[PDB]
Amino acid sequence: SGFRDFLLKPELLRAIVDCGFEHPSEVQHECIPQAILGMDVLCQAKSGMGKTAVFVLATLQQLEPVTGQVSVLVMCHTRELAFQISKEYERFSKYMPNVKVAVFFGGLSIKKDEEVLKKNCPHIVVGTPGRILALARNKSLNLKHIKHFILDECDKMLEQLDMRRDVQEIFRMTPHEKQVMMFSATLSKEIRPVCRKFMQDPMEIFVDDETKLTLHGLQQYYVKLKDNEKNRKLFDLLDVLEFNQVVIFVKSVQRCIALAQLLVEQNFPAIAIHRGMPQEERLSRYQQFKDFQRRILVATNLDIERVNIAFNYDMPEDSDTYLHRVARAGRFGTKGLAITFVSDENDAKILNDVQDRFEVNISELPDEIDISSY
């Protein structure tokens, strides 16, 4: 891996291979060396660019565990986010059993958080601004030993007056000499001042959007149908079209699991991957699809792309999702096939925006006296 040029603890580099990371992203090359040396950093980059990994590895790397002491403080604006970063820490500390983690957010009893803090104080704390605040004031949470204060999606978090006020108070109960890092999708609607408050001459860093996905060199067609007609059409298209591997996109986690099932009952080498499945599992099944073990993939979400045909079993939420689902442009340079299903005017509207945004055309799927293989 290219993470070696980062010289991380071996126990850490191991977790990096199990997570399927082969190479670091631009923001990882851009923000990781400074994060590890203990500098205050302001790493800004468009979503999905690879930011969380940066503070997770960097802290796991500097972290020097002390029983009964919390050394890392991570905050998120939504509990859905904290929960995931908590899992992120878990996945990278896999070979560091001595390192402990815990998340605290509202929606749960504050008495359970205190139970964790008393029975098995963690070294890393993740959570929302208000609950943390409560624990710190309860006195259950002692923040006088924090050495790493990280704010994720600071824009969003700080663009909320009440929460912004909690982040500042928390910040004040923490030591003065410490590493502070912020990560944001935007440069924010004038959030730099609040930022010049937490960081002593921090390093501003900006990584431009990497790889503008394009709909060029892609054959795109639609197939008008009823929802009760889709399965037969899908299956008939799997007997006619030629491929090596295919991805299919379904809305709900349920539809996703019921389709791959049905595909298996008809002897199609299909495996599924939905939004509910935990990461460690998504990579297990993604491996059987990259390994070419299986031929069809039924995803709810979504490198090399040995896939020749991409399906939108049911229309994608909007123009962008379509572009981020279909557009073949990960690594190897080639073409592709995109067939989309439509069952109402809602789907129609979405496909029409696709034709307008990207000035492209999408005709009905054909097959006259020929086929379509070129």
Ligand X SMILES: Nc1ncnc2c1ncn2[C@@H]1O[C@H](COP(=O)(O)OP(=O)(O)O)[C@@H](O)[C@H]1O
- Would you count residue 51 as binding ligand X (CB under 6 A)? yes
Q: Which of 12, 28, 122, 351 binds ligand X (CB under 6 A)?
A: 28
In whole angstroms, give the CA distance from residue 73 to residue 82.
11
Q: Which of 30, 40, 42, 52 binds ligand X (CB under 6 A)?
A: 52
CB of 37 to Mg ion, least distance (A): 21
The answer to whether the annotation marks 276 as part of a ligand binding site is: no
- Would you count residue 47 as binding ligand X (CB under 6 A)? yes
CB 229, CB 70: distance < 8 Å: no
- Would you count residue 25 as binding ligand X (CB under 6 A)? yes
Considering only residues 16 through 55, tell me which ones interact with Mg ion, judged by CB under 5 A.
51-52
In whole angstroms, give the CA distance from residue 260 to residue 199.
50
Q: Which residues make Cβ contacts (< 8 Å) with residue 208, sequence separation at least 6? A: none
CB of 368 to Mg ion, least distance (A): 49
In whole angstroms, give the CA distance from residue 356 to residue 359.
5
Select the binding partner of residue 217 from Mg ion, ligand X, none (C-beta < 5 to 8 A, by kind).
none
Going through 52-184 in order, the beta strands assigned E by DSSP cover 72-75, 101-104, 124-127, 148-152, 179-184
* Span of 17-25, 110-118, 198-206, 217-225 interacting with ligand X by CB under 6 A: 17-25
Q: Compute the radius of gyration of the chain from its Cα atoms.
A: 24
**94, 164, 175, 248, 363 from 314: Cα distances, Å:** 38, 40, 52, 9, 17
Residues 251-276 as b or e (16 or more Cβ within 10 Å = b)? eeeebbbebbeebeeeebebbbbbee
CB of 153 to ligand X, least distance (A): 8
The answer to whether the annotation marks 50 as part of a ligand binding site is: yes
- Would you count residue 82 as binding ligand X (CB under 6 A)? no
Residue whose C-alpha is closest to residue 150's, from 247, 54, 224, 226: 54
The answer to whether the annotation marks 48 as part of a ligand binding site is: yes
Nearer to ligand X, 18 or 227 (CB): 18
Using CB under 6 A as the binding criterion, the count of chain residues that bind ligand X stands at 12
* Span of 42-50, 141-149, 223-231, 351-359 interacting with ligand X by CB under 6 A: 42-50
| 304 burial level (CB within 10 Å; 0-12, 13-18, 19+) | exposed
- Would you count residue 21 as binding ligand X (CB under 6 A)? yes
In whole angstroms, give the CA distance from residue 129 to residue 78.
9
CB of 182 to ligand X, least distance (A): 12
| 91 burial level (CB within 10 Å; 0-12, 13-18, 19+) | middle
CB of 48 to Mg ion, least distance (A): 8
CB of 360 to ligand X, least distance (A): 28
- Would you count residue 49 as binding ligand X (CB under 6 A)? yes
- Would you count residue 24 as binding ligand X (CB under 6 A)? yes
Residues that bind Mg ion (CB under 5 A): 51-52
Q: Which residues are annotated as a binding site for ATP?
A: 45-52
Residues that bind ligand X (CB under 6 A): 21, 23-25, 28, 47-53
